[PDB]
Paper text:
The 12-kDa FK506-binding protein (FKBP12) is a ubiquitously expressed peptidyl-prolyl isomerase with considerable homology between fungal pathogens and is thus a prime candidate for future targeting efforts to generate a panfungal strategy. PPIase proteins all catalyze the cis/trans isomerization of peptide bonds N terminal to proline residues in polypeptide chains. In addition to its role as a PPIase, FKBP12 is a member of the immunophilin family and is the target of the immunosuppressive drugs FK506 and rapamycin. Three extended loops, which have been called the 40s loop (between β2 and β3), the 50s loop (between β3′ and α1), and the 80s loop (between β4 and β5), surround a deep active-site pocket that binds both FK506 and rapamycin.
Three different crystal forms of the apo C. albicans FKBP12, to resolutions of 1.99, 2.3, and 2.4 Å, were obtained. While the C. albicans apo FKBP12 structure is very similar to previously determined FKBP12 structures, an unexpected finding that emerged from analysis of the crystal packing was that despite being obtained under very different crystallization conditions with distinct crystal lattices, all three C. albicans apo FKBP12 structures displayed the same intermolecular interactions between subunits. What is notable about this interaction is that the 80s loop of one subunit docks into the active site of the adjacent subunit and vice versa, suggesting that the loop may act as a substrate. These residues all make direct contacts with Pro104, which rests within an aromatic cleft formed by Tyr30, Phe50, and Trp63. Although most of the contacts that hold the loop in position in the active site are with the central Pro104, additional hydrophobic contacts with Ile102, Pro103, and Ile105 are provided, while Arg100 makes hydrogen bonds with the carbonyl oxygens at the edge of the pocket. Comparison of the C. albicans FKBP12 apo structure with FKBP12-FK506 structures reveals that the 80s loop binds in the same pocket as FK506. Interestingly, unlike the C. albicans apo FKBP12 structures, which were all captured with Pro104 in the cis conformation, in the A. fumigatus structure, Pro90 in one subunit was bound in the cis conformation and Pro90 in the other was bound in the trans state, thus potentially providing a snapshot of self-catalysis.
Author numbering: 3 to 122
The structure:
């Protein structure tokens, strides 16, 4: 099972964790491995809210924000409310070998700075 790479930059409360079916609100910054930004919540002017664990977003996000749907994984730290983290998402947990040209090319690894602002 391919897992995303998660780096905890600032710990949250360590008690509030999203489960599949929960709604979360996050600040995020999405960049390519070359440093070029392709999307961010700042660009929207509002934090992004979505239901996690249901394929509403890229798998790497679902996996990261639900701790692999509750079953965890090796080197897969949990993201609690208030956690600032860096998510490195391999192509297949993102937009894959096709990608979504010209927004994101084929076989792209995505690097996300995210902060979990709220759960439900």
């Amino acid at each position: 099972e391919e897992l995303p790479q998660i780096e905890i930059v600032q710990e949250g409360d360590n008690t509030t964790f999203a489960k599949p079916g929960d709604t979360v609100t996050i600040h995020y910054d999405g960049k390519l491995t070359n440093g070029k930004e392709f999307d961010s919540s700042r660009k929207r002017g509002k934090p992004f809210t979505c239901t996690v664990g249901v394929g509403q977003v890229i798998k790497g996000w679902d996996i990261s924000l639900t701790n692999n749907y509750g079953k965890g994984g090796a080197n897969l730290p949990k993201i609690s409310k208030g956690t600032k983290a860096i998510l490195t998402i391999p192509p297949n947990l993102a937009y894959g070998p096709r990608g979504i040209p010209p927004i994101i090319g084929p076989n792209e690894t995505l690097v996300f700075e995210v902060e979990l602002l709220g759960v439900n």
